[PDB]
Enzyme design. Structure first.
Site: not given
Ligand SMILES: *[C@@H](C(=O)OCC)[C@H](O)C(=O)N[C@@H](CC(C)C)C(=O)NCCC(C)C
Length: 212
Positions: A175, A25
């Protein structure tokens, strides 16, 4: 800034995409902001490569998640290819940005909106689509069908999306779950509640590309 913004009406938003099971995402959100700012600066609406950011952003983690800020930094430093040139595969592979010829577009930097500040985000969206994060884990959000979403949701952000407009009581969100979710792929999230985090943490971490 105006009382309504809708970058779709200004021809600055490409069709809604579906990321699938991959946690990509952060890349879809970033690409939305690039498509928008390139339309704003050049007059042309193009689709750019989410897959390129998945493969090539060495600071994100492919399908295990990532950072919209890191992807926008990558587009400003190197660039990005057209989607048809580097299509979405739903899996991280090796970075193929060099083997695909010159980059289709390049930006000049990346800004952050002042966090926990509704008006700062409205200003940024009035200028252009913005990469934003929110809490999407709640079944109320997962099951959203339409209307102005007020929650329930916490501030545990876990999902990057793109703000492409707003109105008096809402912020308009693109989204990356396909055209069958929400309002043809969009969600309107209530704003103006006075909770500094935003509904579903919408004001936690917002970035946009800079293009002179
Ligand atoms: C987003 C995704 O595709 O979820 C849809 C179901 C990912 O989970 C994502 O990259 N999440 C992201 C949160 C936002 C972008 C701050 C995140 O947690 N990124 C850090 C990388 C890793 C520690 C998960």
């Amino acid at each position: 800034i105006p009382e309504y913004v809708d970058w779709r009406q200004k021809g600055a938003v490409t069709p809604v995409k579906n990321q699938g099971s991959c946690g990509s995402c952060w890349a879809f959100s970033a690409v939305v902001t690039i498509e928008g700012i390139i339309k704003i600066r050049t007059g042309n609406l193009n689709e750019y490569s989410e897959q390129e950011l998945l493969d090539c952003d060495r600071r994100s983690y492919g399908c295990n998640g990532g950072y919209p800020w890191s992807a926008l930094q990558l587009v400003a430093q190197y660039g990005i290819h057209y989607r048809n040139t580097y299509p979405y595969e739903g899996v991280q592979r090796y970075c193929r940005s060099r083997e695909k010829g010159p980059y289709a577009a390049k930006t000049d930097g990346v800004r952050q909106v002042q966090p926990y500040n509704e008006g700062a985000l409205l200003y940024s969206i009035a200028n252009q689509p913005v990469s934003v994060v929110l809490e999407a884990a709640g079944k109320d959000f997962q099951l959203y069908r339409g209307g102005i979403f007020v929650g329930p949701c916490g501030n545990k952000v876990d999902h990057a999306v793109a703000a492409v407009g707003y109105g008096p009581n809402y912020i308009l969100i693109k989204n990356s779950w396909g055209t069958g979710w929400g309002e043809n792929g969009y969600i309107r999230i209530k704003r103006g509640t006075g909770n500094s985090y935003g509904v579903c943490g919408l004001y936690t971490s917002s970035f946009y590309p800079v293009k002179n």
